[PDB]
Design a protein around this ligand. Structure first.
Ligand SMILES: O=P(O)(O)O[C@H]1[C@H](OP(=O)(O)O)[C@@H](OP(=O)(O)O)[C@H](OP(=O)(O)O)[C@@H](OP(=O)(O)O)[C@H]1OP(=O)(O)O
Ligand SMILES: O=P(O)(O)O[C@H]1[C@H](OP(=O)(O)O)[C@@H](OP(=O)(O)O)[C@H](OP(=O)(O)O)[C@@H](OP(=O)(O)O)[C@H]1OP(=O)(O)O
Ligand SMILES: O=P(O)(O)O[C@H]1[C@H](OP(=O)(O)O)[C@@H](OP(=O)(O)O)[C@H](OP(=O)(O)O)[C@@H](OP(=O)(O)O)[C@H]1OP(=O)(O)O
Lengths: 393, 394
């Protein structure tokens, strides 16, 4: 549904209901609780002040009661993987096993890594537990922690990127876009008597915080829904603003000068190396799994050059036409490279983005399968471009 | 567009389409048209008339025959013609062009249009040019058409190797088996005939495929009649898949065609580059070149440009509909526009529009949807050299 897409990177993993010799994987953690109480506290603070001064409507009184309930239910759960998130990983693992049982048979060896963040470790474990229940004779190497920061949390390690993310030139563009797209008064009219008395700044922060609470609720497995606080057109506009925020701060927006994308090259390098070692026999893993974050997936996909995902759109109002974050990095977003060897020992690779075949701007006579030689050369050119970009910052 | 509209494939009507360039380079298919051939209508009519003569029609069959007889009257004399809708489609494309780029077509701007010899393409050109001239009568206009342009607009009739492939190439066994798998005629015939069993599978499938064809073209004719509800949405979906596959295999980048259907379009791509180079160099003073032709012109031209999606090579026939959609490439009035811009540094940019939406090429640009013309030209020249190499094998 359009409403689910307008949750953007908070969208739940979508519904997804001859044999490769290797699978190379990167997956975001599954659906999670909100990481921060900031938006909830802001909504609550506004409605409480209104209640003190007799300023709430009937529905604002009901919203306040509901916000108070969510505050209690979110307490001690911030950033945790939800039941839905566990179920999402079990589905991804389960389909992979169902689709390629030969690959995971007969004491096959798999390795999984995760970041130090608990929701990513727990996503790894839900995935691996499914793997093991299906074939307990798998050999399994499991590790996680800050030792993987350079390939899984590179967005925390590059000084120029951190500065850009915190105070770079994309910020004024985003804020002007929000002011253009989001009209706070009609939304607040639903909840507050005399909403025109609120300054535009506080009105905007209230509404954006409320959208944030509503957008994450379907990821929590809590049986409550707030999608009807906003019309479909209001969700559409909210999504356009958050989509633009993700694009400019994490992807290939001209304002970022490809800095957000270039920082991902160590992960693309490690992907190529693990595949080359398996192909050569230096490694005999049947799969490498990696569990991380939207901030890992988004630039990695752009650096691979998956078609659409690395477009450089110069007009901010055109971004949503050409680049759609809910297609790139929903909850549990994942990239899988599937390697095949044909009868003449040639190596083919299929790229799956959220379990659907993805296109690269190189030729192939057998789409969705690409020549690995051609693909690796292409990816190496992308890494070299990334290194050149970083040499200027 | 609704699903039922998309399932009309290349018979889908042009979709709804409700800083200054110095040149526009255009190719357009004719607008919505009448059926070119009475074969399908006659096959449907002869089966229904013959069953009626032996009292073999259901009530729904009788209603369908009454409708088929009206269509035969209304199609009479009109075969192949541009319809009123086809005219309004061209007026909309020209009108939106004029509104989007008014400075290009102001004062005494010079434009040239060509068309094939086929009347619906000539009439589409004239619908388009009348809009131009009515908006600005001070335009200078050069108008021409005919078989003299077959080499760039109907190259699909001129290449012996391609004509042989189109008529008796290796794609036909694939297409016929795909139709047999996808189309079950018996449920449809039970709707209209008492005892569909007395028909062989061969004639039953011919009847159903003809009825689909009659129903698919009707929205293009401006006749206030409609036959979509003769079929379920799933039946339309399967019919569209078979016709999409036929277009892909006989006209585009299917592996079974070995790029022969696409390579034949290189004279038209070369002529696009020539007319823009002559304007950039000053040899030519035109502000636009317009060209009116056919789906068989547009489909391989788009694939030879390498517009993303449109040149995919899919070996599994069942996967084609997932990755290649003929209603997105060549609906009625399908058109390609190249818009050329000169920035403050005298650099040439080009924007490629497919059916008035920005198209992507597999080359990089820091200002999508605008590409460097130098980079684009070099890429297009590489596409032409590939095409010539493909043709030397045939
Ligand atoms: O720890 P935080 O400072 O709160 O950062 C989180 C987190 O970023 P990191 O995990 O990389 O540190 C989320 O990324 P995920 O782990 O969920 O993949 C991101 O989620 P989105 O990518 O969907 O934006 C979220 O944003 P939000 O709080 O709006 O949900 C963002 O929090 P901040 O927006 O405050 O940076
Ligand atoms: O069914 P298709 O003819 O293949 O078109 C689909 C359809 O777009 P429209 O129905 O509006 O024409 C999708 O809508 P959904 O069914 O997924 O809801 C849309 O997805 P978005 O609206 O999210 O853009 C998607 O576009 P996309 O390329 O982003 O997948 C696009 O597919 P294509 O245009 O690529 O064929
Ligand atoms: O007149 P025909 O020799 O029978 O060919 C026509 C015609 O092809 P050409 O005009 O290029 O020769 C149509 O193309 P358009 O002029 O309409 O653009 C095409 O239409 P489609 O591309 O939509 O298939 C049509 O097919 P149909 O009769 O099923 O509508 C096709 O007839 P053929 O089946 O003989 O190719």
């Amino acid at each position: 549904t359009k409403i689910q897409k307008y949750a953007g990177t908070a969208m739940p993993y979508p519904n997804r209901t001859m044999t490769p010799f290797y699978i190379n994987h990167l997956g975001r953690h599954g659906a999670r609780f909100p990481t921060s109480r900031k938006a909830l506290d802001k909504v609550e603070k506004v409605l409480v002040s209104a209640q003190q001064e007799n300023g709430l409507t009937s529905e604002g009184m009901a919203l306040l009661s509901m916000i108070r309930r969510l505050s209690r239910l979110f307490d001690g759960q911030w950033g945790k993987l939800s039941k839905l998130g566990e179920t999402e990983q079990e589905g991804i693992a389960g389909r992979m096993i169902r689709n390629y049982p030969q690959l995971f048979s007969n004491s096959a060896k798999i390795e999984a890594i995760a970041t130090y963040v608990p929701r990513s470790i727990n996503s790894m474990d839900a995935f691996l537990s499914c793997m093991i229940r299906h074939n307990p004779a798998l050999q399994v190497q499991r590790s996680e922690g800050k030792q993987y920061n350079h390939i899984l949390r590179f967005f925390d390690l590059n000084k120029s990127y951190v500065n850009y993310k915190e105070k770079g030139d994309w910020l004024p563009i985003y804020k002007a876009f929000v002011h253009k797209k989001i009209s706070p008064v009609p939304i607040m009219k639903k909840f507050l008597l005399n909403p025109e008395q609120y300054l535009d700044k506080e009105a905007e922060e209230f509404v954006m915080a409320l959208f944030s609470v509503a957008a994450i609720l379907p990821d929590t497995s809590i049986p409550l829904n707030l999608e009807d606080l906003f019309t479909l057109d209001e969700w559409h506009r909210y999504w356009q603003t958050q989509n633009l925020r993700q694009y400019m701060s994490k992807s290939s927006a001209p304002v970022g000068k490809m800095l957000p994308v270039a920082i991902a090259w160590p992960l693309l390098s490690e992907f190529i190396r693990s595949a080359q070692e398996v192909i050569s026999g230096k490694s005999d893993y049947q799969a490498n799994f990696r569990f991380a974050h939207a901030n890992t997936v988004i630039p990695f996909v752009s650096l691979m050059g998956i078609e659409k995902t690395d477009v450089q759109v110069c007009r901010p109002d055109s971004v949503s036409v050409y680049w759609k974050d809910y297609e790139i990095s929903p909850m549990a977003a994942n990239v899988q490279w599937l390697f095949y060897r044909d009868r003449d020992q040639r190596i083919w690779v299929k790229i799956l983005l959220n379990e659907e075949a993805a296109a690269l701007p190189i030729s192939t006579a057998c789409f969705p399968y690409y020549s690995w030689e051609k693909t690796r050369i292409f990816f190496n050119q992308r890494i070299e471009m990334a290194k050149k970009t970083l040499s200027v910052f």
